[PDB]
Scaffold this motif. Structure first.
Motif, PDB file in Angstrom:
ATOM      1  N   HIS A   1       7.294 -11.478  -8.934  1.00  0.00           N
ATOM      2  CA  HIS A   1       6.482 -11.771  -7.797  1.00  0.00           C
ATOM      3  C   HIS A   1       5.047 -12.304  -8.469  1.00  0.00           C
ATOM      4  O   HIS A   1       4.058 -12.386  -7.573  1.00  0.00           O
TER       5      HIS A   1
ATOM      6  N   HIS B   1       7.595  -2.707 -15.052  1.00  0.00           N
ATOM      7  CA  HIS B   1       6.790  -2.179 -14.039  1.00  0.00           C
ATOM      8  C   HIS B   1       6.559  -3.182 -12.956  1.00  0.00           C
ATOM      9  O   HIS B   1       6.078  -4.294 -13.327  1.00  0.00           O
ATOM     10  N   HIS B   2       6.616  -2.772 -11.526  1.00  0.00           N
ATOM     11  CA  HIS B   2       6.710  -3.895 -10.327  1.00  0.00           C
ATOM     12  C   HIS B   2       5.836  -3.261  -9.382  1.00  0.00           C
ATOM     13  O   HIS B   2       5.303  -4.167  -8.802  1.00  0.00           O
ATOM     14  N   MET B   3       5.712  -2.122  -9.114  1.00  0.00           N
ATOM     15  CA  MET B   3       4.942  -1.491  -7.949  1.00  0.00           C
ATOM     16  C   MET B   3       4.553  -0.083  -7.716  1.00  0.00           C
ATOM     17  O   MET B   3       5.467   0.807  -8.359  1.00  0.00           O
ATOM     18  N   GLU B   4       3.638   0.292  -6.848  1.00  0.00           N
ATOM     19  CA  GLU B   4       3.345   1.542  -6.700  1.00  0.00           C
ATOM     20  C   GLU B   4       3.850   1.762  -5.233  1.00  0.00           C
ATOM     21  O   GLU B   4       3.174   1.111  -4.359  1.00  0.00           O
TER      22      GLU B   4
ATOM     23  N   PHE C   1      -0.849   3.782 -13.389  1.00  0.00           N
ATOM     24  CA  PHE C   1      -0.875   2.365 -13.390  1.00  0.00           C
ATOM     25  C   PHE C   1      -1.959   2.153 -12.320  1.00  0.00           C
ATOM     26  O   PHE C   1      -1.889   2.515 -11.200  1.00  0.00           O
ATOM     27  N   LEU C   2      -2.719   1.073 -12.582  1.00  0.00           N
ATOM     28  CA  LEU C   2      -3.587   0.670 -11.847  1.00  0.00           C
ATOM     29  C   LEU C   2      -3.331  -1.036 -11.108  1.00  0.00           C
ATOM     30  O   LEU C   2      -2.396  -1.701 -11.978  1.00  0.00           O
ATOM     31  N   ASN C   3      -4.005  -1.761 -10.215  1.00  0.00           N
ATOM     32  CA  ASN C   3      -3.604  -3.040 -10.208  1.00  0.00           C
ATOM     33  C   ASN C   3      -3.976  -3.912 -11.227  1.00  0.00           C
ATOM     34  O   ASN C   3      -4.713  -3.742 -12.162  1.00  0.00           O
TER      35      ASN C   3
ATOM     36  N   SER D   1      -2.781   4.499  -9.298  1.00  0.00           N
ATOM     37  CA  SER D   1      -2.928   5.981  -9.220  1.00  0.00           C
ATOM     38  C   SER D   1      -1.727   6.597 -10.097  1.00  0.00           C
ATOM     39  O   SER D   1      -1.099   5.795 -10.917  1.00  0.00           O
TER      40      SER D   1
ATOM     41  N   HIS E   1       5.646   5.093  -9.026  1.00  0.00           N
ATOM     42  CA  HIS E   1       5.967   3.795  -9.716  1.00  0.00           C
ATOM     43  C   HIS E   1       7.532   3.398  -9.568  1.00  0.00           C
ATOM     44  O   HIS E   1       8.312   4.103  -9.658  1.00  0.00           O
TER      45      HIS E   1
ATOM     46  N   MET F   1       4.230 -11.757   0.067  1.00  0.00           N
ATOM     47  CA  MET F   1       4.698 -10.521  -0.214  1.00  0.00           C
ATOM     48  C   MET F   1       5.871  -9.724   1.044  1.00  0.00           C
ATOM     49  O   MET F   1       6.458  -8.777   0.442  1.00  0.00           O
TER      50      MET F   1
ATOM     51  N   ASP G   1      11.323  -5.731  -4.382  1.00  0.00           N
ATOM     52  CA  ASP G   1       9.981  -6.324  -4.550  1.00  0.00           C
ATOM     53  C   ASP G   1       9.629  -7.139  -3.585  1.00  0.00           C
ATOM     54  O   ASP G   1       9.435  -8.170  -3.444  1.00  0.00           O
ATOM     55  N   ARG G   2       9.253  -6.428  -2.397  1.00  0.00           N
ATOM     56  CA  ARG G   2       8.849  -6.833  -1.162  1.00  0.00           C
ATOM     57  C   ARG G   2       8.007  -5.759  -0.605  1.00  0.00           C
ATOM     58  O   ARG G   2       8.158  -4.729  -0.858  1.00  0.00           O
ATOM     59  N   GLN G   3       6.873  -6.211   0.039  1.00  0.00           N
ATOM     60  CA  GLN G   3       5.876  -5.497   0.840  1.00  0.00           C
ATOM     61  C   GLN G   3       6.267  -4.849   2.014  1.00  0.00           C
ATOM     62  O   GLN G   3       5.203  -4.357   2.867  1.00  0.00           O
TER      63      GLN G   3
ATOM     64  N   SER H   1      -1.382  -3.884 -13.809  1.00  0.00           N
ATOM     65  CA  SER H   1      -0.299  -3.239 -14.677  1.00  0.00           C
ATOM     66  C   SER H   1       0.838  -3.900 -14.510  1.00  0.00           C
ATOM     67  O   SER H   1       1.772  -3.387 -15.582  1.00  0.00           O
ATOM     68  N   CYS H   2       1.285  -4.662 -13.417  1.00  0.00           N
ATOM     69  CA  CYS H   2       2.692  -5.143 -13.424  1.00  0.00           C
ATOM     70  C   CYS H   2       3.071  -6.046 -14.524  1.00  0.00           C
ATOM     71  O   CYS H   2       2.343  -6.764 -15.113  1.00  0.00           O
TER      72      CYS H   2
HETATM   73  C1  LIG Z   1      -0.118   0.257  -3.911  1.00  0.00           C
HETATM   74  N1  LIG Z   1       0.315  -1.212  -3.455  1.00  0.00           N
HETATM   75  C2  LIG Z   1      -0.405  -1.953  -2.911  1.00  0.00           C
HETATM   76  O1  LIG Z   1      -1.445  -1.666  -2.098  1.00  0.00           O
HETATM   77  C3  LIG Z   1       0.100  -3.496  -2.629  1.00  0.00           C
HETATM   78  N2  LIG Z   1       1.019  -3.975  -3.455  1.00  0.00           N
HETATM   79  C4  LIG Z   1       0.888  -4.727  -4.369  1.00  0.00           C
HETATM   80  C5  LIG Z   1       1.912  -4.442  -5.758  1.00  0.00           C
HETATM   81  C6  LIG Z   1       1.527  -5.408  -6.972  1.00  0.00           C
HETATM   82  C7  LIG Z   1       0.522  -4.524  -7.731  1.00  0.00           C
HETATM   83  N3  LIG Z   1       1.040  -3.038  -7.493  1.00  0.00           N
HETATM   84  C8  LIG Z   1       0.629  -2.074  -8.079  1.00  0.00           C
HETATM   85  C9  LIG Z   1       1.342  -1.713  -9.141  1.00  0.00           C
HETATM   86  N4  LIG Z   1       1.272  -0.504  -9.975  1.00  0.00           N
HETATM   87  C10 LIG Z   1       0.016   0.195  -9.500  1.00  0.00           C
HETATM   88  C11 LIG Z   1      -0.798  -0.202  -8.487  1.00  0.00           C
HETATM   89  C12 LIG Z   1      -1.962   0.569  -8.180  1.00  0.00           C
HETATM   90  C13 LIG Z   1      -2.934   0.062  -7.263  1.00  0.00           C
HETATM   91  C14 LIG Z   1      -2.593  -1.087  -6.559  1.00  0.00           C
HETATM   92  C15 LIG Z   1      -1.397  -1.582  -6.730  1.00  0.00           C
HETATM   93  C16 LIG Z   1      -0.622  -1.315  -7.586  1.00  0.00           C
HETATM   94  C17 LIG Z   1       1.793  -3.000  -6.226  1.00  0.00           C
HETATM   95  O2  LIG Z   1       2.384  -2.153  -5.785  1.00  0.00           O
HETATM   96  C18 LIG Z   1       3.233  -4.823  -4.996  1.00  0.00           C
HETATM   97  C19 LIG Z   1       4.268  -5.457  -5.858  1.00  0.00           C
HETATM   98  C20 LIG Z   1       5.383  -5.563  -5.193  1.00  0.00           C
HETATM   99 CL1  LIG Z   1       6.931  -5.971  -6.025  1.00  0.00          CL
HETATM  100  C21 LIG Z   1       5.858  -4.926  -4.151  1.00  0.00           C
HETATM  101  C22 LIG Z   1       4.711  -4.526  -3.158  1.00  0.00           C
HETATM  102  C23 LIG Z   1       3.419  -4.300  -3.857  1.00  0.00           C
HETATM  103  C24 LIG Z   1       2.328  -3.654  -2.813  1.00  0.00           C
HETATM  104  O3  LIG Z   1       2.342  -2.947  -2.031  1.00  0.00           O
HETATM  105  C25 LIG Z   1      -1.293  -4.436  -2.275  1.00  0.00           C
HETATM  106  C26 LIG Z   1      -0.222  -3.858  -1.261  1.00  0.00           C
END
Ligand SMILES: CNC(=O)C1(N2C[C@]3(CCN(c4cncc5ccccc45)C3=O)c3cc(Cl)ccc3C2=O)CC1
Ligand SMILES: CNC(=O)C1(N2C[C@]3(CCN(c4cncc5ccccc45)C3=O)c3cc(Cl)ccc3C2=O)CC1
Ligand SMILES: [Cl-]
Lengths: 306, 305
Positions: free
Chosen positions: A41, A163-166, A140-142, B1, A172, A49, A187-189, A144-145
């Motif tokens: 991603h 790590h891919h998502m939260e 993990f925070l934004n 988080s 996670h 996404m 790995d889709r929103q 950290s992927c």
């Molecule tokens: C909490 N997620 C989000 O708010 C968003 N999001 C973004 C993301 C990439 C980064 N990321 C995070 C990874 N670990 C921790 C996190 C903490 C706080 C924000 C993000 C974080 C993601 O989850 C993502 C990756 C994939 Cl493969 C699929 C979907 C998402 C996704 O939903 C923004 C919309």
């Protein structure tokens, strides 16, 4: 004496962390030999996404669109390919700090150390377990992927998680180092959620054995149980079923303390019914499930404090 | 988080660990520049430990009596001296992996990462705090002496602890890197004990702020308190007194969450008086005191090294 949530020394993994950038997206990469592994991603924008078509997004990229940074040095990307949900970037320099390593896919209940990273730079190390619902309770925070999970038994690093998502509950999701997700995650929103989680029963039993080894027996009782009767009780408390494999796995700890596995199961049944009544076990007021039988043997003394 | 007990990345310290052997005793050493630092009890037999005269034991040793091993390479000891409870072995090779470092002495309540080692080889890393009674609740077995505690400030490793012994309650005692013990302990096999411990109040408050930042808000209430009334209650529960310095230190967390420090103190008072009533905070049924205000800010911001 003492019992702590212990991580493996992270140095061997620190020397593999790089920053990967594709346009405006930046995340972490794992540099082993002449390949950099990272979440696919990294080629997506926020708009991509919802329903990304990774094959279509990738075909529009050249090697020079990927910026890889190792410390303060730019690595040159000479090739790229996608393997499941991971992107593999071939670089012109082999990592001189590449440790002896293997890629291993773990099962729920297994533990590992996470080296949390941001912009290719390590920030912290902590211990984690793969939950029965295939998520991990990480921190993990934004940014950290691409941070990885690993074990270092006998000087070889076994990488088991990227790590891919939260998810919406703050837990996670990620993949093994071949890009296969743990769980039914993508790995889709699109709307996704962690399934109902359960307690890792074999691990709680291992941790009760760790407390007996360290000198504590207050929770033991004069009873035993059958495996089936234990499972009927365990499932009423959202505990995972205990299998014959788990019983076999607990053999060495049972021999070292002199307490049969089904006798420890009777103690666990009583603890679930009564609570702790103001007491603690290894400094905890909750029953711990993120230490495996192997972790207990690794950390605890080989001599029980009788 | 998420909120985990997090240690600093240990790589810079891993490259400094060596094995030190004097006769039958083997323990760990810290190799920085051309000096190896280790507990001075490496020169004692089990009988010597009962009443050691370290100067007298040391004067009978030559440089070749100390075997220092770095990986699979023997380091040549060219000098030796003692500084308080630490032995400094001058070696013929400067550590090529020596990071930027400082020796710092920490105060009770401060946290640090421990790199547990055996035979000069790192085995694990964990986070812990200097208790108000000057002991640490570590995880150490025989062979772990000489393992070090540290923090990282940007690129500089601040070494703050070297492991020496385990007390009868299973807790641990050691020195700063200048050989001065934390606590009223001596490096001798004589009757010693951990004193009565207290809870690190400023740290519990920091962890309550971390929980609020993570969505755990059930414990918040409409009430506030004075610092003096809070301290009268805290003393009743074996909590350390909260000072104006602690209040000032919690300022940023108070601004980020909108919960004043004395507002959080009123929440802590209700938790001490009533318990949690079946609830947990950050997955814990006990009030956690091994996260400083700085640790909370660092983990909730992603500071790198
Ligand atoms: C909490 N997620 C989000 O708010 C968003 N999001 C973004 C993301 C990439 C980064 N990321 C995070 C990874 N670990 C921790 C996190 C903490 C706080 C924000 C993000 C974080 C993601 O989850 C993502 C990756 C994939 Cl493969 C699929 C979907 C998402 C996704 O939903 C923004 C919309
Ligand atoms: C629990 N200790 C012991 O039974 C003994 N002991 C030994 C020792 C050195 C090693 N060591 C330990 C250090 N951390 C963990 C441990 C776990 C289990 C055994 C030992 C450990 C010590 O404490 C020591 C050092 C100093 Cl400076 C002063 C006294 C002692 C000491 O009393 C043996 C008698
Ligand atoms: Cl596994």
């Amino acid at each position: 004496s003492g019992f702590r949530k212990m991580a493996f020394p992270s140095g061997k993994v620190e020397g593999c962390m790089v920053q990967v950038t594709c346009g405006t997206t930046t995340l972490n990469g794992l540099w082993l030999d002449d390949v950099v592994y990272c979440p696919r991603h990294v080629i997506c924008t926020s708009e991509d996404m919802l329903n990304p078509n990774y094959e279509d997004l990738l075909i529009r990229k050249s090697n020079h669109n990927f910026l890889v940074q190792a410390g303060n040095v730019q690595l040159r990307v000479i090739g790229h390919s996608m393997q499941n949900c991971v992107l593999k970037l071939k670089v012109d320099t082999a990592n001189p700090k590449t440790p002896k390593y293997k890629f291993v896919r773990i099962q729920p209940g297994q533990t590992f150390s996470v080296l949390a990273c941001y912009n290719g730079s390590p920030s912290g190390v902590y211990q984690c377990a793969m939950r029965p619902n295939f998520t991990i309770k990480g921190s993990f925070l934004n940014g950290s992927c691409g941070s990885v999970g690993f074990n270092i038994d006998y000087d070889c690093v076994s990488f088991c998680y990227m790590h891919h998502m939260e998810l919406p509950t703050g837990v996670h999701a990620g993949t093994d180092l071949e890009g296969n997700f743990y769980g039914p995650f993508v790995d889709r929103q699109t709307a996704q959620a962690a399934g109902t989680d359960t307690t890792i029963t074999v691990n709680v039993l291992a941790w009760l054995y760790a407390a007996v080894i360290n000198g504590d027996r207050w929770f033991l009782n004069r009873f035993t149980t059958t495996l089936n009767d234990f499972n009927l009780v365990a499932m009423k408390y959202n505990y995972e079923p205990l299998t014959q494999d788990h019983v076999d796995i607990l053999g060495p700890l049972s021999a070292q303390t002199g307490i049969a596995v089904l006798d420890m199961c009777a103690s666990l049944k009583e603890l679930l019914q009564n609570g702790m009544n103001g007491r603690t076990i290894l400094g905890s007021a909750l029953l711990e499930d993120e230490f495996t039988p192997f972790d207990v043997v690794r950390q605890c003394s080989g001599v029980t404090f009788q």
